[model samples]
Target chain A: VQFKLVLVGDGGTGKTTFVKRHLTGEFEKKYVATLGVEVHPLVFHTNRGPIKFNVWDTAGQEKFGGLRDGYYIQAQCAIIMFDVTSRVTYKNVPNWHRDLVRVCENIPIVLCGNKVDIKDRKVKAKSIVFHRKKNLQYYDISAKSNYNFEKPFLWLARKLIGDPNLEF
Target chain B: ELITILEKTVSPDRLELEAAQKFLERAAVENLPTFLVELSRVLANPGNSQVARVAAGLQIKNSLTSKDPDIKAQYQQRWLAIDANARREVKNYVLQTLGTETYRPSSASQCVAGIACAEIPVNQWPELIPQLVANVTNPNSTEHMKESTLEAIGYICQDIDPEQLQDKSNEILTAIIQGMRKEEPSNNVKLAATNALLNSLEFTKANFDKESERHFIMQVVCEATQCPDTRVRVAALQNLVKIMSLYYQYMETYMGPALFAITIEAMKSDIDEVALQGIEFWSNVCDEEMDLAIEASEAAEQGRPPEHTSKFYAKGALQYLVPILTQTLTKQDENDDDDDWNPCKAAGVCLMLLATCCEDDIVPHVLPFIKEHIKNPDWRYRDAAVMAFGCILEGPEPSQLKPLVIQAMPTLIELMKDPSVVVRDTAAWTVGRICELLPEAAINDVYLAPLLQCLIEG
Candidate 1:
């Protein structure tokens, strides 16, 4: 089965880094902004079966926002991320979440606080209380350090299929 | 040399015009950048004859819309990479020509300039809207120039990213409404304004939401439906259907009753183009409301807020629309070309969407026709029945209609070999739709061989 997943947030929030680490397992020190949406398909040979993730990595720049809805449609679930170092990027999480819901309603969501590898953490663990009220799963991870990158996708797959015992 | 060739293009002597056309074609293939530069120069010249200017505009239009994608991309990249001064010069020249000139309703220069401006990101030329508005609103501007400007706005609105145009929505809409107003001096201007509004509607949601704005726009479009020109009337009817789909929630009180009268008169139009839009309007309504119909039933069961509820426009109109559509379905001529946009084919498709939206309510209305026509001696009737069946397959809850479709499956397959090519074509298309929507019923081993055989035979 192929499940479509989308990554959305403000520009420079480590979304491209997250997808690259998951797909290639190597983090680059360089930064290049994504101009539009990029699609990557990853397959896991799990004990249950072969599950394919049709991952859509969207441009987070405000100028490319007009094309975001086309990328979100038909996505089974989404990952809304924020930079741990930037309080403004963290605060804009709700806006991205609302926009995603507007286009693809009632889909499952995962909240991630990225850039944990950096020494300065502007967004604290306590500030994530809104996730509980919204009933969203939350994680703190670093794409540069390759920490907990796979956990989000695995949990999302299990939640989507409604099976905790699903083997990967 | 280029001016000599361009002058030759407008000559009364057939050989001279043919020679110029051949030279332009060769230049387009061999040296496109130079060709575009020279072409834009001819267009920008006020001293050029009207015939030569129109020819130049047509050549620009052909190059922009019809060029090979690879070559077009290269040309666009080269254009973008030019020095700021040179790019601005060319851009201003094209816009200036469009601002003053009026050639034909589908003038090449006017549309080409508009689309070309879109190729450069809107941020590059922030003065785009001001220039368009000045030409349109200025009393000194010719009617043809106002019409051409509206055409340019339509192309830009359709091509630009919606967000780029979002901030200018109110301004753009005011210009279009001014041209579309009943007191507007020219029918041609009104028609072009309606077309521009259709393109601009996707980006104008905020303007459309305000009650006063919605009412005014709807009133104008409603009045336009009664215009003496068929083209204007058809364009207005198309906008009504589009608005009904896009802004249905806002249309709850006034537009519904007003549109019913206009569309009914349109459906009964002896002109096929007029009747096609009328049927298409309902088809679009069905497409929009199907989501709400499902949501309403589910909301009732779950005790959730039915905020997305609908008036079931298709069901409300079914009693009135079905009889007209059925009559239209039989209007298909034996000599009708398969690819032509005939109202008879559109009616068949509309009936399908109606049956889909109305679900069980549609069964009684359509089942009688399917039963009567499936075995008819006339291939047209048989073709119409299968087309209707194909359209409804995905519209209704498939389980509700599967038994009926399964009952007709054998005969549908047999009709694949029917003497009429049109009947055979529709049967093939119907079976293809069945395979897409009801796989278990049509994809089993037993039905596979015969389906494949019919496909090979056809």
Candidate 2:
């Protein structure tokens, strides 16, 4: 299965980190917000098959108006994320979710709060608001610590397959 | 079928995209006409999705040329090698697509320029410009068609050598000036036309020759600067900046009556976009005059009539210009956020340029602003003063400015501890300037310790 996956968030969020944590390494912060979209393909080997997700890691800043909407056209799934250390990034999640829904409605989306490895997490895992309100599967990911890194993708892939008897 | 193939080229499916790329790549060389023509057909296909159409158009444009000169020649050879009628069909297909995309003219205008760059240089497409102008001038055509065609004209002029299209300046100007004229009711069309004029400025030498022609172009561009839309006005302002640099010798007639008044007023525009261009015009003027000063002296050394001469515009306008510049600096955005350039930064640069142009004469004009604003309660004013003082260090005489800088050393060093980070940052920068420019005045025992502390910490 191949999916056009969008990774979006505010400028400093760990979106790129999560993308590179796939053994498909060397990313930003290193987080030089790409001038526009940087596309990558990461394949997850499953017992059933190898599933490749085509990733469009777009600029997290809101200012990229010229190319944003065009990048999302025909997108099949999304990972809207924010830095768990900054509540401000969390505050912007609704707008990102709203924008994603507008472009790809009912597309399987998984919200992530990244950098949970840090002790000073502004967003508490149990207190997650948007995922429950929007009924999305939420995960606390540490792309650096590599904690629960695969959960968001697994959940989204499960939703996309739309089969209760599925295992990957 | 071609559209589907083209769509597959952009497919998120990795294997499918690779397959499509190889198929198209092989077919493009093997059946050149069918390959190129089919892509244009995809771009011209209105029933197709805009994404696919835009994608197809991009393929056509990239196929026709490359940034690498050797590869560009290779592609050009391949293009010119094709049967003439097939090439003509491709051109027809591209032209027909212009202004049809409602999302943007992206697919069409670029495709037009891509083909035009290849064809026009070899004298293969005489009809391209005439047809483009006809669309722009023909009232029967949609405004969307007119604007998009003008956009194509801009891109063609931008891409091809000036010598390639210099003969068609009259028709090009006719198409461009028509869209830019105030009578053009649609702002989008006018804005595109205005932007087109910015691109068209380079190849406009022939049209700018006759006095009447120069007058007409100047009048239209000047009128455009006061346009209701900021986008249009800023674009109009850019054309003026380009015009001043390219045709400085011809600008004598317009300077007193139009150029000075228009630009200075633009400097005062509340809109930062407009004001930045306004300041940019004079900055370019200073650049031109400074170069001319070099040219004239080099000519004197060469024993011939120089190709250029100083208009003395910056020197003459120094008093009028510096006040606006200092005042503009005073309205600085207090944030030291250096996520690139802004009008205040531009104002600082322009002041430095003005000081370079007029030399010691700039001191009397600029020093008064610094004295008044240096102590003002507003951080913007204090930062502006420090910025103004720092920038002018290079342009004026070091001997003349040394005493003045020496006296202000205590104030500059002390301001490095000012409440605002912006103020402190600017003061340290100015002290660095003072020390660099006048070591005799700055390396003294009196100001040494605090200056080092300010330099290190601030």
Candidate 3:
């Protein structure tokens, strides 16, 4: 089975970098600024079976646009990204989450604090509390390091499969 | 030059046609005023070919109409930019065509409406309502003139904003309603008026408030429903649907003696043309009453009185309406296409909405019909039972419905493999509705494995 995963965030949050790293496993797509977006198919080999997610990514000029243009349609889950090195990106996390939920309200959403590889990150671990308010979980992701990327996908898979419980 | 460009427009030579079209677009922007005047002239007088004349008429109408707000605004301002003399001449050309065209579906009718939609809102054409009123009401005008003129009013009212037409509502209503009167003998003329009345219903609030006028209007509308022409009857039935939505409060007196029997007979009609409108009238009733019930519910919660109250005509008429709706459902097509529409499909939807409006009250009435037909060998009867069962899953309490859905689940899963795809499809849909609205029944261990296996096979 396939589910659509929408990746939304402000520009310069390393979302493009995250998706690019995952697409080819070590390369930067010379930024085609006009496009500012792309869809990539990501498959996960889980215990249940192989599942696919068509990941729709938004950044650059479309970073802060109204998401009414069918980008979020059929999106069963979302990851709203922010750069921890810039508090501004973190502050706009709610805005992306709000827009995503407005379009596809009942979908699973994960908030990610990116740029964990940078030593002088501005947003601290404790101050990153936007997810708690929304009753959503937060992950400190390092796109450059590829830390904790699988957790969000795993959590979403379990939730989408059906009200889950601790397996024996 | 206009004639030359139009010559290239319909020409078989593709390259020359594109070059001419390119020139035509440039001229329309640069010399818009003179270009509009030439188009109007060409519309009246086609190149010795009716084809080129039609092409000219289409160009004029498209120039004057746009559904997009941005483009419509661009054209509106573009028309405003032209000189006053040229614009007035354009309107004059439109009227000449509207009045003189003997053709049943004249290009002039649409062109006049398109221009009036722009000019009337800005008060640029104060003369339009009076001109239409005169032509439609004038005795000396040919039946074709009256028909075409009335047809133009329909388009104008259809395209223009209601606020723009509010001041001239009486003139427009009187113009069309005059055609709807008993003295008017032409069924084609009456048909045009009835169709116009459908579009103009939203803006005729004041006309309906005046007692004698509203009474006479509905009288003609009802009388026209029984016309010898099936087209006129269908058009009149459509008008009744709009009238019910717009003027439901005033419709109580007509419901018992007229509306009920009229639409019931219509639902029973052999013609698809007539029966669809009959079902549509009740569909509209369901929609309105459901909306009114929500309004009343909210009013109670907010501690304020409601602005309007439902007559609960659906509740009182539920007994009489459901039997006909169920009977109609048994007439489903054997080879019903996925995209096809028929009375059976419409009647099924009406039953669902009635469930929403009446809630638990609709349960007992529809249940017996389902029980009798659920096991019948005929696919139509089986499909109807499952459809009726599926439709009422919502609007009633889960506590009241869960057990029934649970009891029916075994048969529902088995019917997934039925001989007729029609029965198999509806049985699956009913199971789906059960899972969504009454999940407790579908998610139970007894049904889930079998449900999954059956659904997977599909």
Candidate 4:
């Protein structure tokens, strides 16, 4: 089965980096901002069988605002990302979540706090509890350092397949 | 019904083509089994018109490369895993259609064959190379046939990993070189051949290292730079740039006279596209040098003779390059803005990279220009100066240029409010570099608030 997974976040929130690093298993130092939605096919050969993820990497820049709703329409799951270094991106997570929910209904969203490897993290680890009330799972990942990168995807995969014990 | 839609793919009428395309797109998600069968039928059918076969080939390519995993899997499992007779039928049909002499494929047909070659793994079809080369080396083959064969080989090289192509690198390089030789009369054939070489360069190190082979390949590529056809020259020049970057160590043999002259002349071209690649060549040189500098520095810290010495190509070329770049920097059209790809902007970017690569030598030359232009009345000059300063920020030994960059911060920050949007944009980008690389220079109480305010206001 092909799973439609969308990535949504504020611009500069490392959503692109997270997707790219997971897909290629390499962190690119140079940043070329994504213009529109770029789709990638990621296949995982699991013991159960092959699970294919049709990942849609959406541009978070405001210039692409009009095109975003179309991306959210068919997505079965999502990862809502925020930059730990930038508080503004973190603060806007709820707005993104609300927009995504409006278009995609109550699809699974894994909250991602990216760039935790950076020295100055404005969003503290203690804030994880704040998202729990909203029924969201949080992962603090560093795309540069590849820290806990697979946890968010694994959680989403398990949730989508409806098998909590599933591990690749 | 699916077969009928597949047949419509070759229709000369636009509406039929559109309808067929839309039907196939929807079938990818809705009725994929029928889609795969129809695709194979069209591709494998000798009776189908070349146009229909070409369309089917592209459809196969689209399906294989599709972002939807299930859709891709259908092609992989259903189409590729089909009966041996069916796979052979499709493969032989495509090869025959591609290599046929009396009935040579068109541009679209060539593309189909190329994509088909890329999708099928060589392990499953080891004869892929032999079949293509047989046609390419055949005396009676049409230029179009040879072109398509090389195109297919290029596509195959691009899709496969270096290890996959390494064993066959010598034969592949020889075939492409044969196509590019002076005996090839058609410029179109030579252009395609040059492209084939460029695509294969990444994986063909064995071919690149042989002295005689390297000389011939370099001569062909350099001579093509002088081709009257702009596209061929551009393609050849780009290959040279890519070669210089990827195979810099091997470049030691060619850089001084031939490569330098060709690039310098191309840089001075009035054509924007040609000059852009020329400047980009130098920019890539800086990139390669900067990487080597890092390696050498690391080795120094470990108390060893640096693993790699600076070829100093950028440093040696600086005297010739800086004057031309500065001239190009000043040539920005009055109407030029931040978004355009003018040579002036390219020159500014190249200057920045040069500064990064040749930090100490670049400082005296560019500092004079920056001092003169940073506050110039013309926005372009001011913009260029800021861009040059910005590009150099991360390349130099941070401590060496920290004082110079810090002293200029007030001016750089002030340009963020310049009348021209392009100037403002460059100034902002420069400040961002400073904040990221030289955070100590900007994060303190005095500069932080003003910098933030400038960024916000802009």
Candidate 1: Cα lDDT at A131: 50
The residue-by-residue lDDT of candidate 3 on B6-68, one tens digit each, is: 655433343664566567668787888888888887767523354444455556666775535
Task: Name model 3 segments beyond 4 Å from true.
Answer: A1-168, B7-20, B46-50, B62-65, B68-85, B99-104, B118-127, B161-167, B299-303, B402-414, B437-458
Better of 2 and 4 by DockQ: 2
DockQ of each two-chain model: 0.01, 0.03, 0.02, 0.02
Clashing pairs in 2: A28-A31
Candidate 3 clash total?
A: 0
Best by TM-score: 2
- Candidate 3: tens digits of C-alpha lDDT, residues A92-161: 8866774464235357788888889899989997467565334465688887888876666666676677
Local error of candidate 1 at B195, Å?
A: 1.4
Residues B314-433 of candidate 4 have per-residue lDDT tens digits of: 999998898778768766665443433457767876887787677678766666777888998987778777877775666566666675445787787788888988888788888777
Please give the TM-score of chain B in predicted model 3.
0.85
Order of quality (DockQ): 2, 4, 3, 1
lDDT of 2: 0.76
The TM-score measured for candidate 3 stands at 0.66
Error of 3 at B413 (Å): 4.5
- CAPRI level of candidate 4: incorrect
Q: Comparing 1 and 4 by lDDT, which wins?
A: 1
lDDT by residue (tens digit), candidate 2, B279-324? 8888888878888877776634766646776868988888898888
The A-chain TM-scores of all the candidates are 0.94, 0.91, 0.87, 0.93
